[PDB]
Structure formats: structure tokens, C-alpha cells
């Protein structure tokens, strides 16, 4: 976002958005396709004429079906396997961010290969090689277990998302304050 610098017409904004669209197709770095939605990029351009590629891939992460997105696009961008490979990393990434607090309120960290199979549109045997390529490229740091089918990661790039996320973030800090009323008040009486 820069008002004075880079003054271009309306036609060149959609042409620049086309370069911003094809930039994130072949890599997952710097958040995801939904990062440009919060910035005045997708909201400043029309939703048709193949300018919606950044918008459809955001909802495709939760749906997890390549055939739905491949039907709305052309053969040019659908013939590159890099787009299909690097899209699966972002689909599990949402499930990878669930390891801290999403559903379970006890902060229990467990990952089953069957939950991410339908989300990433990948079989169970290829899950071991999917997470293996993530460590080699420096995407995630952690260790995995093939025997118990358990994955534990340190962090990836926690997103700017809000709502139910920030609501659970406050609950974890309450446990820090709960020890003040439990363990903290006992030490003050000593």
C-alpha cells in the first residue's frame, strides 16, 4: 500500500494483479493466496476474466478438491504440476496450525493421516513423503513418527487470521493468570 509512489491507471492495476496471481501459484512462501485478499488487490479488481484465481484458491484450501478449481481455469496454468504440488502443502498447513489450539481445549497435539488425506487430496502412503519434502525446503521444523503416525512441528509461519483464533489465544493466557490465583496466592502466604 503506497499512495504517492507507483501511480498507474486502472488497466495496469489488473495487469499487475495478474503478475501477483502467478507469483504465488508456484510457491507457498509469505502466507498464502489469501494474503493478497486482505491487501487492496483482489477487492480492487474484477471477479471475472480469470482474475479470481487468488480468490478461488483460498476457499479451495478448506474444500480440498483440485477438480473444482481446474474446471474454472484453462490448460495453461493446469498443466504445471508445481501448482498442484505446492497447493497440498497449504491445505495441510491449516491442519498443521491446529496443533496448538483449534478444537481441543486441552492443547492435546495429535495428527492423523486420514484427516489430512481428504483435505489435501492425497493418499495415506504418500503422507510420509509429503511432510519429508517440507523439512528439506525449510518449510517446517520438527520430527515425525512413522510407527505411531504422529507429527509434531515447532512452527511454520503463523498467519494473520483472527476471530476464533484470537478467542482461544486469550483462554491460554487465563491459565497463566489462574496460577496467580492458585499457585501464586499460596506463595504470598508463605
Amino acid at each position: 500500500t503506497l499512495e504517492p509512489s507507483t501511480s498507474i491507471t486502472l488497466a495496469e492495476r489488473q495487469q499487475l494483479a495478474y503478475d501477483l496471481s502467478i507469483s504465488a501459484l508456484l510457491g507457498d512462501k509469505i502466507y498464502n493466496f489469501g494474503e493478497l485478499l486482505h491487501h487492496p488487490i483482489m477487492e480492487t479488481i474484477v471477479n471475472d476474466s480469470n482474475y479470481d484465481w487468488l480468490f478461488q484458491l483460498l476457499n479451495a484450501l478448506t474444500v480440498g478438491d483440485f477438480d473444482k478449481f481446474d474446471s474454472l481455469i484453462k490448460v495453461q496454468i493446469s498443466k504445471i504440476p508445481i501448482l498442484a504440488q505446492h497447493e497440498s502443502f497449504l491445505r495441510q498447513k491449516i491442519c498443521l496450525m491446529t496443533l496448538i489450539e483449534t478444537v481441543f481445549v486441552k492443547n492435546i497435539r495429535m495428527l492423523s493421516f486420514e484427516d489430512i488425506s481428504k483435505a489435501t487430496h492425497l493418499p495415506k502412503d504418500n503422507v510420509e513423503h509429503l511432510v519429508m519434502r517440507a523439512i528439506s525446503l525449510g518449510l517446517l521444523k520438527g520430527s515425525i513418527d512413522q510407527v505411531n503416525e504422529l507429527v509434531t512441528i515447532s512452527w511454520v509461519q503463523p498467519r494473520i487470521i483472527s476471530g476464533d483464533q484470537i478467542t482461544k489465544m486469550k483462554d491460554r493466557l487465563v491459565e497463566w493468570n489462574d496460577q496467580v490465583e492458585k499457585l501464586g496466592k499460596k506463595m504470598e502466604a508463605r
Partner: protein, 89 residues
Amino acid sequence: AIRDEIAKNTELSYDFLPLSNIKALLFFNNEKETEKFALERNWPIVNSKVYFNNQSKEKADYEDEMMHEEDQKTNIIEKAMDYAISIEN
């Protein structure tokens, strides 16, 4: 009182209770009398078997500094250090 004591022998420790055997332990003539004793003692019932899930004990009013505490367990050791300090005081 005899049947209640012999039943508690295989209750707490011994986990998964049989069907026809426990009838002979407590001297039951009818099999329907066996199920009547299970309802009063709250025995979990499964298919063709009777288990016991109550082995774990908790609650029982309040307990402090006894039976595997959590926050107070650390203060017990910390109290021993301040104990020798309070004597010199």
C-alpha cells in the same frame, strides 16, 4: 455381609467380571439374583460381559498435601527450606 465382602475381593483389583462364575462366589441360586446385585453396585454392562470402570477413585470431599497433589506438592518441599529459616529467625 458375607456376599458383599467376597464380591469386593474381585471388584476393585480384578477388573473384568465374569457371568456364571461370580454366581458361585456369592452363593446365588438364581441367575436373575446376580443381575439384581449388579444394579445396586453400579457395574458397567457390555455385550456378553460385565466390566468394572470404577477402579479409579477421586473427589471424596477435599484433600490437601496428600495422595498426589499438584500445586501444593511443590510447596511441601518449598516449606522445608523455609522451615529451617524460620527456626533461625
